[PDB]
Ligand binder design. Structure first.
Ligand SMILES: *[C@@H]1O[C@H](CO)[C@@H](O[C@@H]2O[C@H](CO)[C@@H](O[C@@H]3O[C@H](CO[C@H]4O[C@H](CO)[C@@H](O)[C@H](O[C@H]5O[C@H](CO)[C@@H](O)[C@H](O)[C@@H]5O)[C@@H]4O)[C@@H](O)[C@H](O[C@H]4O[C@H](CO)[C@@H](O)[C@H](O)[C@@H]4O[C@H]4O[C@H](CO)[C@@H](O)[C@H](O)[C@@H]4O)[C@@H]3O)[C@H](O)[C@H]2NC(C)=O)[C@H](O)[C@H]1NC(C)=O
Ligand SMILES: *[C@@H]1O[C@H](CO)[C@@H](O[C@@H]2O[C@H](CO)[C@@H](O[C@@H]3O[C@H](CO[C@H]4O[C@H](CO)[C@@H](O)[C@H](O)[C@@H]4O)[C@@H](O)[C@H](O[C@H]4O[C@H](CO)[C@@H](O)[C@H](O)[C@@H]4O[C@H]4O[C@H](CO)[C@@H](O)[C@H](O)[C@@H]4O)[C@@H]3O)[C@H](O)[C@H]2NC(C)=O)[C@H](O)[C@H]1NC(C)=O
Ligand SMILES: *[C@@H]1O[C@H](CO)[C@@H](O[C@@H]2O[C@H](CO)[C@@H](O[C@@H]3O[C@H](CO[C@H]4O[C@H](CO)[C@@H](O)[C@H](O[C@H]5O[C@H](CO)[C@@H](O)[C@H](O)[C@@H]5O)[C@@H]4O)[C@@H](O)[C@H](O[C@H]4O[C@H](CO)[C@@H](O)[C@H](O)[C@@H]4O)[C@@H]3O)[C@H](O)[C@H]2NC(C)=O)[C@H](O)[C@H]1NC(C)=O
Ligand SMILES: *[C@@H]1O[C@H](CO)[C@@H](O[C@@H]2O[C@H](CO)[C@@H](O[C@@H]3O[C@H](CO)[C@@H](O)[C@H](O)[C@@H]3O)[C@H](O)[C@H]2NC(C)=O)[C@H](O)[C@H]1NC(C)=O
Ligand SMILES: [Cu+2]
Lengths: 680, 678
């Protein structure tokens, strides 16, 4: 038995000029797996012709290329779509480019209706979501959470089977027996209790942390990161003023994703992330209970050999790529892809990031190439373990968890691969000169004490709408759709406050950063900062004004810069829209981790951690970064001061720095699977 | 920083008659690594002649065999001795038989003096220890703890290096700095703080439980078990009337050891015991920091291939020895080693046990064989990873070559888990217990309560002077005291209260077991799979009167645990007052009470207690000489001596399961032993 989640939603008034767009968007995402002939979009799309409106798109080459590809023929409906499938990738990229360059919202809506009526549902939804996120006239509206747009990618096969059975039966034949199987009929809706994956899917006791790696917020955060910074798009469209920092961002996000993951491994006593060799048997197995269009996801058997003949070519490329980077580390200063690079400069990080993502910015100074290959894509294909026939043949593919950004974080091999990549990047980082005392010491400021309230974690029920997973009848489409709600346990932490005491000789503006990190490693020994600098997670980052004398700063966890609130359901979105309000976090803070995942759980019911507090002078960001003020607090690199290796730890024993030891406890049931009828 | 362990020893008066013998025994154990010409035993050993005293030994064949072996020449002094070396074992067996068949204590003392003067020190100490344990006339005599007889086998190389440096320097050159290196000078003694092995010695996070597998008493328990029941001795001369229950004892002891190890692994979050394939490679790295005569112990890497060019023969034997057993399981009833075996009967357990130990009892019905093989010996040789050589005068010691260090190696646990898996496959034959045998009509356990369960680390001091070589002046007058002070696990006292209802007034037996609740995957363990992981902790009798009953059992009165042994100095102090440590005479073969509970956590680790009440039945008559180790006629581990097939039919009103939590107070890790942490 677990308590039910109840929370208040932060709301902001919506611009009256955007009341028409929002609705329209929400109308095109209803039952996107099906086309209803009775809807307006059906007629609009059926009658719309792209070429006749070629003047309504800013760029003309986009229209010509889209027309050429459409004449060549797109993929048929009712098939699995993945951005890693080359032909589908080209088609969806062309469609997205057509969407983005539409001169006005009316043309964009007409094109979206055309795409939904004529094109594959998956490509349509992907491109439409990306365009809504990136279009200028759609800034301010709210989109549904990814787990409500793709429910099948965020639940296991058993719950989906139950939902499909209920839909086919149009209710319960014997309602009294429903509760004994985890199905509750209440308030015109059906609630299905959902578990997490067990030892059948994960080996080596990793299932203990399933609740964390299968959490909807985790995968939704990864998908949001992909959507905001797609690898195939040019940086200028993505980030205008801070394009040169793209690689840095690539390093900052993944470094965080792994670190948190590592922390969870320490909470469950699983140790460090394994390392592997490409030319040796892979020891981590994976048996996902996931399916798309009833097609099972690929299963990787234990001791799978990656260097078979069929994959040999790919392997070679992978190896070569790695080798090349090492050679660059020996050169130090060189020219690659017609770009001059000096590794003694921190700025070079950008290039490094791009190099390991194989994104468009890496090939911006070279003529358009018909030959292109991605290290990440090849590694994902090799580790997916799908049959080679699936790869070779175009009209058939067996889906893998690594072929979608909504399910990549479920596979353990993802973490190992990106840990290898980050190991290479840190080997590069070893070049940079460590920060000196002059830059770390804030003369005149001393932190006297840091106090923290009790840190408690617990599981609570969370409900999310999964109606889009089923196919509806004509009558349901006409009158109203059924409501199938998945109720699952989720991790959460109680509110807590950090109190900091600071003595200042002078009055000035300062920047305060709060980080979280582990204390002991898998072997039970304390971790020195020289190795722990990469494992710290940045929690808070804010400005303050210090007056002469003593000062106290109380910072509530509900105000941390790098975390957001949980997304609201579609019905609540409609309720708020009818009253002219929208959720602020879903508007402009959706690219941040959920606040419920700040703290680890711990299998021993008590886990030690450490908090790091640093205060340094404030300097305003350069003016040109004006339209990015909401996301940049100062001009320092992301992760400062833990952005480069620490060589001499005694430089961090400054008056303006403080390390605190804290303990995280668990309240209630230690495990999340106590959700049966007799346990409730 | 940890508290220092101080506790008075519960002593008992010793019979005056044995007093002298006690003295003599201790005199023969002083500085056994060296021979002092000025001691009394030297002249006796140099002048004693066994052949001329052939009439003083009850058996004549033993004397003839020993003389024939001695004519060929025994092993040289200052050499490594191991019972798993064939020639050394052959010599030491004859020496032990000569000790055992001595007419009286005077002849035995003369023979021991002769052996110490002439023979290898290791063989002499081994044989003398075993004989003192087994000789009837020496029964009731206190022996020093094994870790004080072989300190080098119970401490790592760094502490021994510090001790050797102090001995060579005859003190400290700059005393005011020794404190910073964990060496304290006080009260005419030197104290050396010691750490347990870390990840450098153990891989795959095993080092987290190094405080348990490297505990001195944990290994001393296994050495005591080997000494009391040695594989090369007949059942009659080692156990007496409990000769048909030898295999049962073997299975019970090994199952309990593995269950406790699994509980510790669960407490440290390491999961289940891995299984391995002989034709594949072992996945347990081990780099012991141990030395004997400065010769390093064998090291094994993380990925060691067991089947190499020089092992094939042994491998083959191992494989065959397994397959034959499987064939027996298919036959059911057969004739092996001139013995009829029926696996449908529970008593067959005996045979099974012997079969998996290759002890002498397995071959008591066939003619004396010159072709000798042992499954356990070959498995230990294969797993030790020591270099293979055909020369008898060159050996690289391994942890598995000594019973004092066997438990330090995970391969031991894996191998015996495999063996017990085979034995449980055999046990599947037996018919499960029925309700009529389990249900205790008119008896219901209403409630069970237990006080707070607490674990902590405390400093413990033990004498390690025997590891060094003394000078002539030290031998003549007195040697210094080198004491090792190391953290050890301990638990605070707790009491179990059982509330029962029975309108019938009768005698009954109560058993208490401790076991796990969740497996490595975090799911509850069903009794049909958890019956092999339950550790018996208490076994006693009680008279129930009509109506309500409340039984209070204290942790200090549990049957299967003892108290800690004491150093030789306290033994002499008590002997001067005609007293001996009672627990070193009574229950000196059981586990210490400090290891009863697995180490807890700040939040708390979950486990469970099982309480079982059943009718009492007195042990059989011929079992009278051994009525200090048993309480009734039921098999060891009852009712969990055979598989549980249906938990529904096993549970009865007279059984109770309770869930408990174990907490930790103070430091969670044992390595905070630096000068700045005190
Ligand atoms: C560098 O390496 C080399 C190569 O190993 C070493 O050289 C070896 O050194 C050892 C020890 O010093 C030698 O062993 C000793 O050999 C002595 C000579 O014996 C010869 O004559 C006798 C008859 O008198 C024969 O029996 C011997 O061999 C025959 O018999 C043996 C019986 O087992 C058979 O195995 C052979 O195949 C032969 O058939 C030789 O021909 C020997 O006297 C001595 O034996 C004593 O000590 C052993 C110890 O186990 C007893 O078993 C034995 O009964 C004798 O008893 C003595 O024991 C102690 C002293 O140790 C005291 O109580 C008394 O003194 C008592 O008399 C021993 O076996 C080995 O031969 C030699 N190998 C060579 C040269 O090839 C170097 O030492 C080494 N150097 C360093 C610095 O490490
Ligand atoms: C068992 O397995 C077999 C083999 O895998 C499979 O057979 C294949 O079926 C698919 C259909 O699912 C076939 O694909 C179709 O082929 C026809 C015929 O193409 C030939 O002829 C044309 C000229 O007429 C040539 O250009 C062509 O190269 C071939 O030689 C096409 O007409 C189909 O094209 C339409 O659909 C495509 C999407 O699939 C679009 O890209 C294309 O533009 C066409 O669009 C049409 O529909 C749109 C949506 O309504 C509409 O908007 C358009 O205006 C247009 O009307 C299609 O490519 C394939 O050729 C078969 N292969 C073989 C070897 O037989 C079986 O189907 C399968 N059975 C089952 C039960 O699974
Ligand atoms: C789980 O998820 C499912 C699916 O997402 C949820 O089901 C959805 O619920 C919402 C809220 O109830 C629905 O939106 C509302 O729909 C009603 C009914 O619309 C129908 O009936 C109308 C007459 O009563 C009819 O006019 C409608 O047709 C018009 O609109 C379509 C386009 O949608 C257009 O093509 C037609 O030509 C018509 O113009 C339709 O047939 C509707 O009345 C609501 O409108 C109000 O709100 C909007 C927005 O504020 C406002 O603009 C309007 O003026 C009006 O005030 C609203 O749109 C949605 O249709 C459901 N989806 C499906 C597939 O059925 C379910 O609720 C979720 N459960 C949870 C979270 O527990
Ligand atoms: C650690 O161990 C050593 C060696 O076992 C101890 O030294 C031993 O101490 C005993 C008791 O003092 C000695 O026995 C006594 O000897 C005197 C003569 O000195 C005799 O009169 C007594 O009747 C008794 O027999 C023993 O000889 C001595 N051994 C050596 C080799 O010196 C030491 O005391 C132990 N220290 C601690 C703290 O336990
Ligand atoms: Cu594996």
């Amino acid at each position: 038995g677990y308590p039910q989640y109840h929370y208040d939603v932060e709301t902001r008034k919506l611009d009256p000029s955007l009341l028409n767009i929002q609705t329209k968007v929400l109308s095109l995402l209803e039952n996107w797996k099906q086309v209803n002939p009775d809807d307006e979009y059906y007629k609009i799309g059926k009658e719309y012709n792209v070429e006749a409106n070629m003047e309504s798109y800013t760029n003309r080459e986009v229209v010509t290329e889209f027309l050429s590809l459409y004449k060549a023929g797109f993929i048929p409906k009712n098939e699995v779509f993945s951005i890693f499938y080359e032909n589908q990738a080209l088609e969806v990229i062309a469609l997205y480019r057509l969407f983005y360059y539409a001169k006005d919202f009316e043309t964009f809506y007409k094109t979206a209706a055309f795409a939904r009526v004529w094109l594959n549902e998956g490509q349509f939804v992907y491109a439409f979501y990306l365009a809504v996120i990136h279009r200028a006239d759609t800034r301010g509206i709210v989109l549904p959470a990814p787990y409500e747009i793709w429910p099948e990618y965020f639940m296991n096969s058993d719950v989906l089977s139950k939902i499909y059975r209920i839909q086919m039966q149009k209710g319960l034949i014997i309602p009294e027996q429903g509760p004994y199987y985890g199905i509750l009929s209440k308030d015109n809706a059906y609630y299905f209790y959902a578990n997490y994956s067990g030892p059948l899917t994960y080996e080596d006791n990793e299932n203990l942390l399933s609740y964390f790696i299968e959490d909807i917020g985790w995968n939704s955060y990864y998908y949001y990161f992909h959507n905001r910074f797609p690898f195939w798009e040019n940086g200028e469209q993505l980030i205008g003023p801070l394009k040169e920092r793209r690689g840095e961002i690539y390093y900052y996000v993944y470094q965080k994703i792994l670190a948190r993951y590592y922390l969870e491994r320490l909470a469950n006593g699983l140790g460090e992330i394994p390392r592997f060799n490409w030319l040796d048997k892979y020891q981590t197995s994976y048996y996902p209970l996931l399916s798309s269009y009833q097609l099972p996801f690929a299963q990787r058997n234990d001791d799978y050999y990656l260097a078979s003949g069929d994959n040999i070519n790919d392997i070679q490329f992978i190896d070569t790529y790695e080798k090349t980077f090492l050679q660059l580390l020996q050169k130090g200063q060189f020219k690659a892809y017609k770009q001059e690079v000096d590794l003694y400069n921190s700025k070079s990080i950008n290039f490094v990031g791009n190099y390991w993502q194989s994104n468009a910015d890496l090939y911006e100074k070279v003529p358009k190439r018909n030959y292109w290959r991605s290290y990440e894509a090849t590694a994902r294909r090799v580790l997916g373990a799908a049959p080679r026939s699936s790869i070779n043949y175009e009209n058939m593919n067996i889906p893998t968890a690594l072929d979608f950004y909504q399910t990549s974080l479920r596979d353990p091999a993802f973490y190992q691969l990106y840990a290898k990549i980050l190991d290479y990047i840190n080997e590069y980082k070893e070049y940079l000169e460590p920060y000196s005392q002059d830059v770390l010491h804030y003369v005149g400021v001393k932190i006297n004490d840091v106090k923290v309230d009790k840190l408690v974690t617990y599981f609570e029920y969370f409900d999310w709408n999964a109606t889009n997973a089923v196919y509806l009848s004509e009558q349901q489409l006409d009158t109203v759709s059924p409501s199938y709600i998945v109720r699952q346990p989720r991790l959460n932490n109680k509110p807590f406050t950090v109190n900091i005491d600071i003595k200042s000789d002078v009055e000035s503006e300062v920047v305060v950063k709060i980080f979280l990190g582990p204390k002991y490693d898998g072997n039970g020994l304390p971790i020195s900062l020289e190795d722990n600098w990469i494992n710290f997670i940045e929690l808070d980052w804010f400005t303050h004004k210090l007056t002469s004398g003593q000062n106290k700063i109380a910072r509530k966890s509900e105000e941390f810069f790098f975390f957001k609130d949980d997304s609201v359901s579609l019905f609540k979105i409609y309720e708020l829209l009818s009253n002219g309000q929208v959720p602020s976090y879903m508007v402009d803070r959706y690219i941040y981790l959920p606040r419920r995942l700040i703290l680890p759980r711990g299998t021993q019911r008590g886990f030690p951690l450490q908090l790091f507090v640093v205060v340094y002078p404030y300097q305003a960001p350069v003016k040109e970064w004006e339209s990015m003020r909401q996301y940049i607090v100062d001009n320092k690199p992301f992760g400062y001061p833990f952005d480069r290796p620490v060589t001499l730890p005694y430089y961090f024993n400054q008056p303006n720095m403080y390390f605190k030891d804290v303990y995280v406890y668990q309240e209630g049931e230690q495990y999340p699977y106590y959700n049966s009828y007799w346990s409730q | 920083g940890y508290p220092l362990f101080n506790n008075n020893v519960k002593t008992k008066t010793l019979d005056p008659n044995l007093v002298n013998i006690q003295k003599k025994v201790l005199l023969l154990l002083e500085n056994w690594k060296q021979v002092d010409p000025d001691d009394e035993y030297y002249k006796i050993g140099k002048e004693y002649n066994i052949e001329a005293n052939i009439e003083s030994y009850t058996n004549r064949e033993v004397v003839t065999e020993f003389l024939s072996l001695y004519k060929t020449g025994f092993t040289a002094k200052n050499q490594i001795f191991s019972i798993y070396y064939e020639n050394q074992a052959l010599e030491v067996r004859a020496l032990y038989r000569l000790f055992y068949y001595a007419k009286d204590f005077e002849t035995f003392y003369k023979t021991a003096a002769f052996a110490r003067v002439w023979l290898n020190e290791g063989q002499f100490i081994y044989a003398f220890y075993i004989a003192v344990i087994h000789r009837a006339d020496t029964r009731g005599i206190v022996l020093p703890a094994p870790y004080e007889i072989w300190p080098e086998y119970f401490v790592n190389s760094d502490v021994l290096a510090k001790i050797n440096r102090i001995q060579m320097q005859k003190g400290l050159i700059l005393p005011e700095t020794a404190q910073y290196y964990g060496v304290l000078a006080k009260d005419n003694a030197y104290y050396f703080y010691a750490n347990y092995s870390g990840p450098w010695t153990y891989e795959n996070n095993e080092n987290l439980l190094s405080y348990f597998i490297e505990d001195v008493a944990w290994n001393s328990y296994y050495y005591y078990f080997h000494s009391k029941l040695q594989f090369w001795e007949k059942g009659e001369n080692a156990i007496g009337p409990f000769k048909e229950r030898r295999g049962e004892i073997y299975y019970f002891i090994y199952q309990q050891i593995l269950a406790r190890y699994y509980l510790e692994r669960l407490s440290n979050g390491l999961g289940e015991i891995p299984r391995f394939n002989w034709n594949d490679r072992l996945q347990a790295g081990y780099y012991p920091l141990l030395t004997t005569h400065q010769i390093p112990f064998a090291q094994r890497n993380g990925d060691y291939y067991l089947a190499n060019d020089d092992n094939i023969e042994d491998i083959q034997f191992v494989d065959s020895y397994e397959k034959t057993f499987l064939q027996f399981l298919q036959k059911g009833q057969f004739k092996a080693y001139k013995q009829e075996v029926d696996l449908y009967n529970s008593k067959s357990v005996n045979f099974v046990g012997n079969y998996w130990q290759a002890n002498v009892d397995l071959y008591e019905k066939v003619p004396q064989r010159n072709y000798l093989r042992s499954y356990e010996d070959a498995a230990r040789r294969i797993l030790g990873a020591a270099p293979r050589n055909s020369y008898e005068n060159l050996n690289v010691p391994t942890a598995l070559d000594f019973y004092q260090t066997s438990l330090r190696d995970p391969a031991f646990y894996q191998l015996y888990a495999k063996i017990l898996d085979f034995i449980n496959q055999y046990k599947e034959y037996l018919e499960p217990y029925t309700q009529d045998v389990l249900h205790f009509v008119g008896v219901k356990i209403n409630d069970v309560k237990v006080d707070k369960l607490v674990t902590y680390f405390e400093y413990f001091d033990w004498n390690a002077t025997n590891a060094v070589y003394l000078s002539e002046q030290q031998l003549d007058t007195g040697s210094p005291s080198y004491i090792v002070r190391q953290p050890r696990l301990n638990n605070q006292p707790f009491t179990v209260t059982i509330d029962i209802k029975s309108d019938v007034e009768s005698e009954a037996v109560i058993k208490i077991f401790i076991g796990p609740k969740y497996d490595g995957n975090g799911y509850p363990i069903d009794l049909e799979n958890n019956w092999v992981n339950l550790v018996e902790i208490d076994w006693f009798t009680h008279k129930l009167t009509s109506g309500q009953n409340k039984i209070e059992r204290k942790s200090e009165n549990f049957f299967w645990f003892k108290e800690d042994s004491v150093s030789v100095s306290k033994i002499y102090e008590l002997l001067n007052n005609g007293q001996v440590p009672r627990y070193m005479i009574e229950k000196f073969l059981l586990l210490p009470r400090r290891l009863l509970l697995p180490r807890g956590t700040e939040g708390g680790v979950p486990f469970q207690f099982f309480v079982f009440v059943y009718p009492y039945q007195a042990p059989y008559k011929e079992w009278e000489p051994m009525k200090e180790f048993v309480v009734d006629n039921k098999p060891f581990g009852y009712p969990f001596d055979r598989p549980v097939t249906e938990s529904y039919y096993f549970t009865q009103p007279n059984m109770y399961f309770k869930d408990v939590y174990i907490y930790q107070e103070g430091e969670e890790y044992p390595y905070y032993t630096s000068y700045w942490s005190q």
